[PDB]
Structure formats: C-alpha cells, structure tokens
C-alpha cells in the first residue's frame, strides 16, 4: 500500500551515524553579530525570502554579499545557517562570511563571499566546449561534497551558479531550500525551480535523495551543450512533465510510475499524451554543434532519466569521459 520506499545509492546512511548536533538544525542556537561592519551599497535583488545587496566591509573594505532575511520561519533559518556552516571550506561552496543583526532595525541577514558573476544569459553564448566541461567539474566537487555531508541543495539552476570568468571561479549558492538527507525521509516536493524539478518532484514521490540536484545539473547541461534556456520549458508544474515526457517518451514515465507504485493526479492522464523517447541528436543543430560530442550526450543521457537511482551520482559523473580533457 502506497509507493515503494527508496534510498540513496551514495552516502546513505552518512548524517546517521553522526551526532543530532550536526543535522538537527532546529536545536542550533544562531549568534547575531553587529552589521556596523558592513554598509549597503546597491540593491542586487528581491531573491523569494530575503533583500539582497552587494555590501563592503567597512573594516578591510573587502567586497561582501548581504542576504537581509523578510521575516521567516526560524525554523528555515537555521537550517539554511547549520548547513551554511557545516558546508563551509567545501570545494565550491559559497563562504558564509557573517551572521548579523542591524542594531537599530533588528533584521537579521546573513553575509557571503562576493563574486563577481557574469550573468548566465551573457556568459553561456560566450562558452566553449572546454569551458562547459571545466565549469561542470566545479558544480559535480560541489554537489560530491555537499551529498557526502548529508546535505541536498534541492534548487541547482543556472542563477544559483555564481561564475567569475575571468578567474575561473565558481560558487554553488543560495542554501536556502537545502536540507538534510535521512534514509527513509519522506520530504516536501515544493522545492527547487520550475525548470529544474525532477520527475520525482512533479509526480509527487517524496522519498527523493540527492540524486535530484543531478537532475537538475542536466536541465543546465542540456540548455547549455544545445543553446536553449531553459531546456525544459513549461507553463506550469503539470505541463513541465509534459515538456520532460515530449523529449524522454512516456513508456518509461509510467514504467517509472509503476515500478514505484506513484499515484498519478488525474490531471496528468488528459495532458501527457503518448510521446517516443527522442534522440538527443534530434537537438544538435549547425550553432551548437561545437559543443556536443558523444561523450556530452552520453553524460547527459545518464542525468536526464525518469528513475532517480537510476541517474549518475556525482562521483560517477566526475569519472566520465566526459571530463577527461578537464580533469
Ligand atoms: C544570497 C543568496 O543566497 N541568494 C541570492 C538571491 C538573489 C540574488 C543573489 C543571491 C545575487 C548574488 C550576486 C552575486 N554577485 C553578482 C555580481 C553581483 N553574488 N556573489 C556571491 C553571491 C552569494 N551568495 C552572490 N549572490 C544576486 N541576486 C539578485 C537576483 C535577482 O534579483 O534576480
Ligand atoms: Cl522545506
């Protein structure tokens, strides 16, 4: 009765045999600094909870990141904070600088490492087939370390991405909706953006592990080896599996639903359709032709799968061959 169960492939049991301290977030006490050391520069953005500006750090003038929280969930605070800092020193892991507080206003915000991006919509055109795969290699160190911490970032997509080209630097950030991997755990699907949801999001299966944010890391793969952002476009949640299903085929999404027992919505029966499974050649065209060659396509392949346990973890995508000109 209900679906099957399921568990990560990799790094199953790894916030298990650690002490409550390390993942149960909710008994961290957060310590507030004074904000006085920083002062606001310009309004970045609105990101969903939070204000965001570039700063400077009045004290060594060094460039900073401020994430001036709305007011949330405390809850969601400290796990963004506990993971913020557990992650901390990872291989490509944006730097959680500071914890503080405005001392008149009483708004908390938390303080990164600044990097000076390219945005993604200028810099993708400018990438060669080398740039693709050295900047795929940081995101993969990323997300191998981060998975073997516990930890899913559950919102990879190419804003998260922050890429200082001219230094080949790259940082995986906004922690936000980043939790926790217990074996068993049965999590919220709400999660990650609409372009970047994995099937397992979409369908309703709860019992998901890090192997969605490899789905996601093939969303940004395939819109960038193509030219085409986003590479999954739907209107909706709904019609998102309906994209996926019109390029992966339809047999093996409800072979997929079967072999987990997931209870389809009924919306889905009107709107999906009957689809082959087309080959990713279909999509290589004279202006991104450059950038594909078998090895991209048979990566791709690996990510981009209906069945979860079925993707590359990041380990095994470091070691395709793929990356062997980068590595
Ligand atoms: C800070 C965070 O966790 N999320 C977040 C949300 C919105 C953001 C940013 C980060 C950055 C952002 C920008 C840069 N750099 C660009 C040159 C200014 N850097 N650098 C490091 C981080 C971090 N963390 C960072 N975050 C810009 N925006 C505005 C996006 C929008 O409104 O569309
Ligand atoms: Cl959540």
């Given at each position: 009765?209900?679906?099957?169960?399921?568990?990560?492939?990799?790094?199953?049991?790894?916030?298990?045999?650690?002490?409550?301290?390390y993942?149960?977030?909710?008994?961290?006490?957060?310590?507030?600094?004074?904000?006085?050391?920083?002062?606001?520069?310009?309004?970045?953005?609105?990101?969903?909870?939070?204000?965001?500006?570039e700063?400077?750090?009045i004290?060594?003038?060094?460039?900073v990141?401020?994430?001036?929280?709305?007011?949330?969930?405390?809850?969601?605070?400290?796990?963004?904070?506990?993971?913020?800092?557990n992650?901390?020193?990872?291989?490509?892991?944006?730097?959680?600088?500071?914890?503080?507080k405005?001392?008149?206003?009483?708004?908390?915000?938390?303080?990164f490492?600044?990097?000076?991006?390219?945005?993604?919509?200028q810099?993708?055109?400018?990438?060669?087939?080398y740039?693709?795969?050295?900047?795929?290699?940081?995101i993969?160190?990323?997300?191998?370390?981060?998975?073997?911490?516990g930890?899913?970032?559950?919102?990879?997509?190419?804003?998260?991405?922050?890429?200082?080209?001219?230094?080949?630097?790259?940082?995986?950030?906004?922690?936000?909706?980043?939790?926790?991997?217990?074996?068993?755990?049965?999590?919220?699907?709400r999660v990650?953006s609409?372009?970047?949801?994995?099937?397992?999001?979409?369908?309703?299966?709860?019992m998901?592990?890090?192997?969605?944010?490899?789905?996601?890391?093939?969303?940004?793969?395939?819109?960038?080896?193509?030219?085409?952002?986003?590479?999954?476009?739907?209107?909706?949640?709904?019609?998102?599996?309906?994209?996926?299903?019109?390029?992966?085929?339809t047999?093996?999404?409800?072979?997929?639903?079967?072999?987990?027992?997931?209870?389809?919505?009924?919306?889905?029966?009107?709107?999906?359709?009957?689809?082959?499974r087309?080959?990713?050649?279909?999509?290589?065209?004279?202006?991104?032709?450059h950038?594909?060659?078998?090895?991209?396509?048979?990566?791709?392949?690996?990510?981009l799968?209906?069945?979860h346990?079925?993707?590359?973890?990041?380990?095994?995508?470091?070691?395709?061959?793929?990356?062997?000109?980068?590595?």
């Open positions: 009765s209900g679906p099957v169960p399921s568990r990560a492939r990799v790094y199953t049991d790894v916030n298990t045999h650690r002490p409550r301290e993942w149960d977030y909710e008994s961290h006490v957060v310590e507030w600094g004074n904000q006085d050391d920083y002062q606001l520069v310009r309004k970045l953005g609105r990101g969903k909870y939070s204000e965001v500006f700063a400077i750090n004290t060594n003038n060094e460039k990141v401020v994430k001036i929280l709305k007011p949330v969930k405390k809850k969601k605070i400290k796990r963004e904070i506990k993971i913020l800092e992650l901390r020193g990872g291989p490509n892991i944006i730097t959680l600088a500071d914890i503080v405005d001392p008149v206003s009483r708004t908390p915000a938390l303080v490492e600044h990097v000076n991006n390219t945005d993604f919509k810099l993708y055109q400018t990438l060669t087939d740039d693709i795969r050295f900047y795929m290699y940081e993969l160190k990323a997300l191998d370390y981060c998975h073997s911490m930890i899913m970032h559950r919102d990879v997509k190419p804003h998260n991405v922050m890429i200082d080209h001219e230094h080949r630097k790259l940082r995986l950030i906004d922690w936000g909706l980043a939790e926790f991997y217990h074996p068993g755990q049965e999590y919220n699907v990650a609409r372009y970047f949801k994995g099937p397992e999001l979409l369908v309703d299966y709860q998901y592990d890090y192997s969605l944010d490899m789905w996601s890391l093939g969303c940004m793969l395939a819109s960038m080896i193509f030219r085409k952002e986003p590479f999954f476009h739907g209107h909706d949640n709904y019609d998102q599996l309906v994209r996926i299903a019109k390029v992966l085929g047999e093996d999404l409800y072979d997929y639903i079967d072999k987990y027992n997931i209870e389809l919505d009924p919306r889905f029966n009107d709107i999906l359709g009957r689809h082959s087309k080959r990713w050649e279909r999509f290589v065209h004279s202006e991104n032709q950038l594909v060659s078998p090895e991209a396509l048979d990566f791709l392949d690996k990510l799968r209906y069945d346990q079925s993707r590359l973890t990041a380990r095994e995508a470091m070691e395709h061959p793929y990356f062997y000109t980068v590595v």
